[PDB]
């Protein structure tokens, strides 16, 4: 009644690669404070994953932008659905730890 994942798959799926990552818009647009956003977060393919080597780190290499429809709701005064843009990671990579 139980399931196992083979090691080849574990290494493969948890590697450095763009993953759909849910990101709260607050983290991305911190200056529009006097505006609550509905939904509060957006799905963005961001970087992530093990490089399995100290020298290297999961860094983005190809980046682009997706504009999505978001309800900018002023807290109690009025709302409007505006096209706020966000950054996404097309491609990531494992590159040395510059230091």
């Amino acid at each position: 009644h139980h399931e196992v994942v083979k090691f080849m798959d574990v290494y493969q799926r948890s590697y450095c690669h763009p993953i759909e990552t849910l990101v709260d818009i607050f983290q991305e647009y911190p200056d529009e404070i006097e505006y609550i956003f509905k939904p509060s977060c957006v799905p963005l393919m961001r970087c992530g994953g093990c490089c399995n080597d100290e020298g290297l780190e999961c860094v983005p290499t190809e980046e682009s932008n997706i504009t999505m429809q978001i309800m900018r709701i002023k807290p109690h005064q009025g709302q409007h659905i505006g096209e706020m843009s966000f950054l996404q990671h097309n491609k990531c990579e494992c590159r040395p730890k510059k230091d």
């Epitope: 080849m8 290494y11 493969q12 590697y15 450095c16 690669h17 290499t61 491609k91």
Partner: antibody, heavy 120, light 103 residues
Amino acid sequence: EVQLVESGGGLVQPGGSLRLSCAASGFDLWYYSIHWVRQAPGKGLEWVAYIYPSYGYTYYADSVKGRFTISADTSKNTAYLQMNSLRAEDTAVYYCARHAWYYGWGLDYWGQGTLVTVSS
Amino acid sequence: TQSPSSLSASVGDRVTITCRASAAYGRVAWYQQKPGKAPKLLIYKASELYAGVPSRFSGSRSGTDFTLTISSLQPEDFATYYCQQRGWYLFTFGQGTKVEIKR
């Protein structure tokens, strides 16, 4: 365990079309990488193209760009290299291979070899 | 590029092929091309060794010049050897090295 099986090879007159098939065993294409590498007559290897299913990556070499298209059918565990404008230079043995991240940037389990001849 | 173009040593003679990288962060591979057959890989990540590959096989990295090393050359290892320079968006194969053997 892991096996790659190729098909679609044959003869095609200059200008014609043909689809290669690369079926995979013990190993899902979705979380992995399938490349087509052609070895021209008596010459070295040549990376034709790749597809990275879970990433949406379809990069082809410039010689076949536009002429060829790599693709994959998840249900049949199978990659396809649809060639549409086969010219003389396309004559080659076409290999399909897996690129697993555990082996870094590299083609582990390889295909068997399917021969494509562009002649009228 | 690859070097040597061709070489004839005997059994046991240490033999080393060298590959140039005019580089891409030391992501290199080594493959063995038996007579008209499927290229099998021997070295990945430019120093790691594929499963089954003999202990006599080895890799090294001189900055931008990666080499393949066979210590006790055994007769089975007659092939053409290739290096994979790799690249996320710029994969490029090595020149190839004929592994000749004087009898």
